DNA sequence: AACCGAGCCAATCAGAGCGAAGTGA
DNA sequence: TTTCACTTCGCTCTGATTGGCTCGG
């Protein structure tokens, strides 16, 4: 479970690598920090979506709940960009 | 340095997440467990035994 | 408005680059032929992080799909924001302090106050 | 001078993906 | 009773995990 509370570090560190110049290096420190930030990002947004689902007496968190939670929590750019992505997944 | 007022849209969820992480810290001790040198004994022993080049790299 | 978070707290060249990156993300998410089996992050591990919350019961396949994409954009824009501080200090190595410095520029990152203490 | 630590390499096997079966509202 | 929408099962197969050395900082 201790490895399960984060996304795999190699996957996170690869995305960081592609974000930086070819000559750039990343401290193990920074990879672990990013790993912790990403996991909080998921849990923070999920918690907001989860509480609204419990209030409306719905057992299932869906894509639309994640987008609504993103807007509520001040990730408006994320929600708006992913809105088209969800509708194309559903068709 | 901790501010009194943070992002108004996030503050209440931040408090609830602090409560949620405290409860996971009580039951699993995960917030303070720390990181193991390696996750898996099998993958460790693998890496240790593997044929290596003179530069300490895994061989071609 | 909706896109304030893209440029929030950034100056000069950094503003143009992050805006161009977000226009690149928007163009990609608006594209018509996605393969929903191709992601940088595993869906099962995203779903496990969500299920760490005992308040969460059942999760639609939609949610980890949105997060896979969302988390990529998050990691990318924060790493690009953090790199600014490495360049400021004439370093080729990204350090934890570079991420901490980046978080302080936008209130969008306030939810990480406990993950990366100030 | 001495020290610190991230990239480099690729094979195993933990586990991610997936179809089938199980669950319940 | 069947249907719907998820979980859990069973299994196949793949890509994340992994450390000794170098040499710039």
* Cα B7 versus chain centre, distance: 26
Q: Are A55 and A37 in contact (CB under 8 A)?
A: no
Taking the CA of residue B20 and the nearest CA in chain A, the distance in Å comes to 9
- Tell whether B7 lies on the interface with C, counting CB pairs under 8 A: yes
Residue listed under structure tokens 């419990």 = A54
Those residues with Cβ within 8 angstroms of residue C42's Cβ, 6 or more apart along the chain or in another chain: A7, A8, A11
* Cα A41 versus chain centre, distance: 5
Cα distances from C116 to residues A16, A63, B16, B39, C71, in angstroms, run: 17, 28, 18, 23, 17
Range of the domain at A20: 1-91
Query: Domain extents for chain C?
Result: 12-112
Contact at CB, C113 and B2, closer than 8 angstroms: yes
* Level-2 CATH architecture, domain B1-60: Helix non-globular (6.10)
Which CATH superfamily hosts domain C12-112?
Answer: Histone, subunit A (1.10.20.10)
CA-nearest residue of chain B to C115? B31
CB < 8 Å to B17, chain A: 40, 43-44, 47
Give the separation between CA C56 and CA C53, rounded to whole angstroms.
6
Residue listed under structure tokens 């299932």 = A60
- Tell whether A3 lies on the interface with B, counting CB pairs under 8 A: yes
Write down the experimental method used for this entry. Answer: X-ray
Count of structural domains within chain A: 1
DSSP H helices, C1-118, are 4-7, 13-29, 43-51, 62-88, 96-103
Residue C25 burial (C-beta neighbours within 10 Å; 0-12, 13-18, 19+): buried
Contact at CB, A89 and C65, closer than 8 angstroms: yes
The interaxial angle of helices C13-29 and A76-90, nearest 10 deg, is 20
């Amino acid at each position: 479970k201790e490895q399960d509370r984060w996304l795999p570090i190699a996957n996170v560190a690869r995305i960081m690598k592609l974000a930086l110049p070819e000559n750039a290096k990343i401290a193990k420190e920074a990879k672990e920090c990013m790993q912790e930030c990403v996991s909080e990002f998921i849990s923070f947004i999920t918690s907001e979506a989860s509480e609204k689902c419990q209030q409306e007496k719905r057992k299932t968190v869906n894509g639309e709940d994640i987008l609504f939670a993103m807007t509520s929590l001040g990730f408006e750019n994320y929600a708006e960009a992913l809105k088209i992505y969800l509708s194309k997944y559903r068709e | 340095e901790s501010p009194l007022y943070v992002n108004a849209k996030q503050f209440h969820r931040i408090l609830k997440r602090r409560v949620a992480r405290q409860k996971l810290e009580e039951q699993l001790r995960l917030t303070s467990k720390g990181r193991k040198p390696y996750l898996h004994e099998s993958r460790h022993n693998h890496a240790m035994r593997r044929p290596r080049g003179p530069g300490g790299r895994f061989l071609t | 408005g909706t896109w304030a978070n893209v440029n929030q707290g950034l100056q000069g060249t950094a503003r143009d680059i992050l805006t161009t990156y977000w226009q690149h993300v928007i163009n990609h998410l608006e594209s018509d032929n996605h393969d929903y089996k191709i992601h940088q992050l595993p869906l099962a591990r995203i779903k496990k992080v969500m299920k760490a919350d005992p308040e969460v019961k059942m999760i639609s396949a939609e949610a980890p799909i949105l997060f896979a994409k969302g988390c990529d954009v998050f990691i990318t824009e924060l790493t690009m924001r953090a790199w600014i501080h490495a360049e400021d200090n004439k370093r080729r190595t990204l350090q934890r302090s570079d991420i901490a410095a980046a978080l302080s520029k936008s209130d969008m990152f306030d939810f990480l106050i406990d993950i990366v203490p100030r």
